[PDB]
Design a binder for this molecule. Structure first.
Ligand SMILES: Cc1ccc(S(=O)(=O)N[C@@H](Cc2cccc(C(=N)N)c2)C(=O)N2CCCCC2)cc1
Ligand SMILES: [Ca+2]
Length: 223
């Protein structure tokens, strides 16, 4: 996250780290056995790490659980990043508690101007790399459709929205992929892509989760 702040340990209790011997993507716990993340985070050999703050130290409250299956949306397009959403089933259920908790799915889409919280262990630098130990947070508004499409002509589908700051300096970045955009208690977005990180006039682009709520529900009900 570029331009954000240290969240505070376990203050974002639905935030997950996907790990294969190192953190590679975030995700969101939506019930005790299922995580939503981005399709471009798909890999084999995923351990889901719950209740994390410092990802390099065992501090207490962590739960490490292997993925038993990862379900990439059948219409995921890796060239356009359209339908950039994946569901991960845990090998066993997480213990829910104050520090490990589900986030609610939306019942409607959010409006432009809605303020949201984005979080992750991704790169904190626009130019170089610096990966944090602890979880970073960024408050960001959802941008209007027309501003989003002006920023990225021809590249924004109805399953994408922009959020962040056109002046630059505040954005998600590499390694935040798959993580939550939460607006008034509901998971509205998944960190998907952007040009660079925190560049002027190039906001972050996020999978629009309200378009996927019945697919998520029907998929979980059959698996
Ligand atoms: C299709 C695509 C678009 C943009 C890039 S990127 O190197 O400019 N920017 C990266 C880094 C990134 C990741 C997540 C969010 C942002 C952001 N600027 N909000 C940026 C990207 O979009 N990624 C998502 C796709 C997989 C590689 C990582 C690379 C590939
Ligand atoms: Ca830890």
């Amino acid at each position: 996250i570029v331009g954000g702040y240290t969240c505070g340990a376990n203050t974002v209790p639905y935030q997950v780290s996907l790990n294969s011997g190192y953190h590679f993507c975030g995700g969101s716990l939506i019930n005790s056995q299922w995580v939503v993340s981005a399709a471009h985070c798909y890999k084999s050999g995923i351990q889901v790490r719950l209740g994390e703050d410092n990802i390099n130290v065992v501090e207490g409250n962590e739960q490490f659980i292997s993925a038993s299956k990862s379900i990439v949306h059948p219409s995921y397009n890796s060239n356009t990043l359209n339908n950039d959403i994946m569901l991960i089933k845990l090998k066993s259920a997480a213990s829910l508690n104050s520090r490990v908790a589900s986030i609610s799915l939306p019942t409607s889409c959010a409006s432009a101007g809605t303020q949201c919280l984005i979080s992750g262990w991704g790169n904190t630098k626009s130019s170089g790399t610096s990966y944090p130990d602890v979880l970073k947070c960024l408050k960001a508004p959802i941008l209007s459709d027309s501003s989003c499409k002006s920023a990225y002509p021809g590249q924004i589908t109805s399953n994408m929205f922009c959020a962040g700051y056109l002046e630059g300096g505040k954005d998600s970045c590499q390694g935040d992929s798959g993580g939550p955009v939460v607006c008034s208690g509901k998971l509205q977005g998944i960190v998907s892509w952007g040009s660079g990180c925190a560049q002027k006039n190039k906001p972050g682009v996020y999978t629009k989760v309200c378009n996927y709520v019945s697919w998520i529900k029907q998929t979980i009900a059959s698996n």
